[PDB]
Amino acid sequence: IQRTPKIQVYSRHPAENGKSNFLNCYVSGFHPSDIEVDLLKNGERIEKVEHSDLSFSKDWSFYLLYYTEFTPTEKDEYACRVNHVTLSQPKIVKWDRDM
Amino acid sequence: TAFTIPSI
Amino acid sequence: AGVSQTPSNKVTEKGKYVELRCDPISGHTALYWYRQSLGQGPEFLIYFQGTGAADDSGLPNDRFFAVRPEGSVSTLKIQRTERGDSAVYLCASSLTGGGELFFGEGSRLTVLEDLKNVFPPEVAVFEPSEAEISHTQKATLVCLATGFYPDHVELSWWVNGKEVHSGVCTDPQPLKEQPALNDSRYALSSRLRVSATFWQDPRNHFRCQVQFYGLSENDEWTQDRAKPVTQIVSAEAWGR
Amino acid sequence: DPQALSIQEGENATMNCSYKTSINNLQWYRQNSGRGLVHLILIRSNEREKHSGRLRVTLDTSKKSSSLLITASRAADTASYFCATDDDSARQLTFGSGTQLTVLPDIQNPDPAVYQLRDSKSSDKSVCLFTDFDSQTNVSQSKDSDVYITDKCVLDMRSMDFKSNSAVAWSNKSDFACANAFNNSIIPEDTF
Amino acid sequence: GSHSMRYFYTAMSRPGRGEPRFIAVGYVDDTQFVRFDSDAASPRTEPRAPWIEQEGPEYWDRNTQIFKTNTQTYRENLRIALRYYNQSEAGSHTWQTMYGCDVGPDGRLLRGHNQYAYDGKDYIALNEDLSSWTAADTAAQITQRKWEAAREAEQLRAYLEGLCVEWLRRHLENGKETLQRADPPKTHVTHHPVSDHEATLRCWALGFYPAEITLTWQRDGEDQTQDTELVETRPAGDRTFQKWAAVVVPSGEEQRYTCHVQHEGLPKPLTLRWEP
C-alpha cells in the first residue's frame, strides 16, 4: 500500500513584509518514505533547505518538515514542489500567508 | 536509553 | 546436539595465523563469540546478527576478525598470534538476541614462545595393593602421566576394549613439576576402583589411555627429538 | 571472584554475585564444568524471585546483587557457577567472576589408608595412595623438590553405591616412602 | 501525569541503489530529543533537544552501540521477511517500529507500547497485558511463535518498566523548563469574504505545546461538524505547533459563531468570535 503525501506550506510567524521568517512545508501522510521536496522562490529552487528527521504517525504514514529562512515581500511568491511515487507529475503548491 | 530489538 | 565448535584444541607458536570454527543451532540468528582463561568469566568478543557484526567491541585488536558469510557458520581469525591470546574461545547461539545462550564446547588454544618445549607424556599403569584387597577387598589402579607439555590432555580408562567413566577419577588440573615458572612440564594422575573379584579374575584387561594435543602436519621439524604430534600414549595391565 | 564453596552433599549451596551495570534487562545463572561449555537459568529485573527444579534465584536491583541457591546439592552439581547480566537490554551478555562449587560426599565409613602401589613392568616409583579417608580431611602442599601430591579426589562406584576420596604421592627418591608422603597434611591415623 | 518516551524506527531495502538503511528518532511527549541515521559518514547518536546535550559520553557511546546493533538486526529482518513472504530480492521493502512508555502522575508505568509494521501494514504488536501479541498475518505468526519461545515479551516488559521509565524521568528533570511547561496557543480569528453572499472566518492557534488541541466552530453554540474544515496540527519549526479551522457562511451572521479552543495550558476553554 502507498499513500500520497499531504502538503501544507506556511510560515512560522505571521508574515510581515520585510521581516525575516521561516517558510515551512509540511509534507505528511505518505508511504513509502521516499519523497523529493523543493522550496520554490518564483519557481526556482531555494537552495538552503533543511528538513526534519524522518518519523511516522500511529498509522505508519511518514512526515517531514522542509524549512528555510526568507523575508516575505509583496511581489515575491513561494511554493513547495513535491515528488512521490504516488504522484504522476510533481506537485506545486503556492504559499498562502492566508494559511 | 533505547531498546535493542529481537530478530525476525 | 547443539553448537559444535572446532577444532577443540589448537597449539602453535608466536606470529602464526589461527582460524577457529563454530557451527551454531539452526534458525538461531544471534551468534556470539566469547573467550575465557583459567578461572575467570568468559569475556565478550563479538556478536553477530545474521550475516554481520552488530557488536564487535569485545575484539581486543585489529588482529581479531570474525566472519559468518552465509549467516550460519562463523569463523574467528586471529593474526600475529601471541602468548597473550592463549585461552578457550567460546561460541554461543541465541534465537533472537540475548536471553538464553547455547554455547559450543569450545576451542582450547595455547600459544607458546617456541615449539621447542612441546612434550608428550610418559605413561605408567600402577598395580593395586594386596594390603588394599585385604583391608577393603577392592582394587585401585593409579595412572601417572609424566613430563608432558602443554597441559592439553584427556585421560580415558578402558576395561577390556570398552570405556567406562564409572569408578574412575582424574584430577581437575595437572600441576607443575618444576613449579618455579610458567614454562613447567606438567604432571597429572588418575585412579579407578574395581572389586577385588574383578581384578583377581585373571582374564580381565586394563588400559590407561592418555590423549596428548601437540602439533600436526602443518608444523615444522628442526629437531633431533621425536617430533611431538597429537597422539595417544597408553599403558596396559592384566589380572592376578 | 567470590571464593570456592565446598559443602557436604545433601546440604544447601548458596551462591552470590553482583552486577555493576546500569540496568539489566535480565540476569542469568550459568553452569561451567571441567573443560566443557557454559549453561543456564534466568530472572528479569521486574520479578524479585524465581524457582526452577532444585534452584531458586533471587534478584535485588537495589544492591545489584543476586542469590542462586541449590537445594539438596548433589555430586552432579559440582561445577563453577557464573552470573550473566544483559547490559542495557542491549543483548550482549556480561559474565562475572563467579564461584567454584565443590559438593563432596559424606563418607560414613572412614578407612584412612596410605598404601604403596607398584607400577606394572618396572620396579619404578613408589606411589603412595591416600585413600578411603574422611571428607573433612585435607591434603596440603608438600614443600620439597622431590615431594609432590595430587590433591583429594572422589570416585563413585555406581554399580555398588560406593564413594571414596583419594590423593596420590609420587617421587623418584629413597629419602621417601609412605609414612613420609603425608607429613604436611592434617591426617587421620590408619593402616601404615 | 501522562508523560511518555517514544522511539520510532524506520529501515528499508534499497535494491539497485545501496545497503539497507536504518533511522531512529526519539521524543519525550511532543519534543524530539535524539536521532540516528545509518547512512551517516560514521553513524552516531546525535542530540535534537538542547537539554540532552548534558549527558556524558557513556550515553552517546551506548546508544550508538544499540543503534549499530539495531542497524544490523534490520538488515537481517529485512532478509528474513523476504523468506516468510516469497518476495524477490529486487524490490525494496520497509520495517517500522514504535515502542514507548507512559508514566503516572507519580511516575509508574501507565501504558507501554511496542508495535511492528512491514511495508505500511501492521505486522506484530504487543498487547496491553505486556505478555501477548497481536499478529497481523501468517508471517507475523511465525514471529509470534519465535518470540513466545524466547519469551521476548518479557524482555520487552523489562526494558519498558525499567530502563525507559528510569530515563524518561532522568530527562524530564533535566529539561523540565522545556518538557513540563504547557504552552497555550495565541489565538486569532480572521475575516475572508468569498462574496457578498457568503464569507468565511478562521480560528487560528499559533505557537502552542503540546500538539493536542481542539478548534471547534460552534454555530449558535454547536459543533457544525459537517460544514467546518480543519487542517491537521502542523509544526512551527521551533518546538511549537499551529492549527487553524474555517467555515463558510452567509454574511452578517458573525457573532453567533463562537470558536471553542481547548488546550492543556488553558484554564478556560476559550470561546471566541472576532470582528474589526
- Residues in chain E within 8 Å Cβ distance of C25: none
Q: Among E173, E149, E147, E158, which residue's Cα sits nearest to residue E51?
A: E173
Is C93 in the same domain as C10? yes
Question: Domains of chain D, with CATH numbers?
Answer: 1-105 (2.60.40.10), 106-192 (2.60.40.10)
Q: What whole-number distance in Å separates Cα of residue D88 and Cα of residue E271?
A: 49
Contact criterion met (CB below 8 Å) for A29 and A70: no
Is C7 in the same domain as C106? yes
Per the entry, the structure determination technique was: X-ray
Q: How far is D98 from chain B (nearest CA, A)?
A: 27
Select from C54, C95, C98 the Cβ nearest to the Cβ of E72: C54
Q: Where are the beta strands (DSSP E) in C74-219?
A: 74-78, 87-93, 102-103, 107-112, 122-127, 138-148, 153-159, 162-163, 168-170, 175-176, 186-195, 205-212
Residues 6+ apart with CB under 8 A from E83: none
Q: Is C70 left (phi over 0), alpha (psi -120 to 50) or beta?
A: alpha
Q: What whole-number distance in Å separates Cα of residue E80 and Cα of residue E73?
A: 10
Chains with 3 or more CB pairs under 8 A to chain C: B, D, E
Which CATH number covers residue A36?
A: 2.60.40.10
Integer Rg of chain A from CA: 14
Contact criterion met (CB below 8 Å) for C47 and C101: no
D145 residue type, one letter: S
Contact criterion met (CB below 8 Å) for E205 and E215: yes
Contact criterion met (CB below 8 Å) for D8 and D74: no
Which CATH number covers residue C218?
A: 2.60.40.10
| C-alpha cell of residue C211 | 590423549
Buried/exposed code over E136-150 (b: 16+ C-beta within 10 A; e: otherwise): beebbebbbebbeeb
Q: Among A8, A14, A3, A2, which residue's Cα sits nearest to residue A66?
A: A8
Q: Is D82 exposed, middle or buried (0-12, 13-18, 19+ CB in 10 A)?
A: buried
Residue C67 phi, psi dihedral angles, 5° rounding: -160, 160
Sign of the four-CA dihedral C193, C197, C202, C205: negative
Domain of residue C138, residue span? 114-240
Is C107 in the same domain as C131? no
Is C95 in the same domain as C170? no
E75 residue type, one letter: R
Q: What whole-number distance in Å separates Cα of residue A90 and Cα of residue C15?
A: 62
Give the Å distances, CA to CA, from E191 to D175, E205, E207. 118, 15, 21
Q: What resolution in angstroms does the PDB record give?
A: 3.0
CATH of E1-181, one of 3.50.30.10, 3.40.50.300, 3.30.500.10, 2.60.120.260: 3.30.500.10
The owner of cell 601404615 is D192
Nearest residue in chain C measured CA to CA from B5: C97
Contact criterion met (CB below 8 Å) for D79 and D57: no
The CA-based diameter of chain E, rounded to the nearest angstrom, is 70
Contact criterion met (CB below 8 Å) for A28 and A80: no
- Domain total in chain C: 2
Is C53 in the same domain as C96? yes
Give the Å distances, CA to CA, from D111 to D140, D150, D188. 19, 19, 9
Three-state helix/strand/coil letters over D17-41: EECCCCCCCEEEEEEECCCCCCCCE
Q: Is A54 exposed, middle or buried (0-12, 13-18, 19+ CB in 10 A)?
A: middle
Per the CB < 8 Å rule, is C97 touching B8? Answer: no
Q: Where are the beta strands (DSSP E) in chain A?
A: 9-11, 21-30, 36-41, 55-56, 62-70, 78-83, 91-94
CATH 2.60.40.10 fits E182-272, yes or no: yes
Q: How far is E50 from chain A (nearest CA, A)?
A: 16
Is C139 in the same domain as C62? no
Is C125 in the same domain as C206? yes
Q: Among A6, E247, C32, which residue's Cα sits nearest to residue D93?
A: C32
E105 touches chain A (CB under 8 A): no
Q: Among E246, E268, E251, E270, which residue's Cα sits nearest to residue E260?
A: E270
Per the CB < 8 Å rule, is C170 touching D166? Answer: no
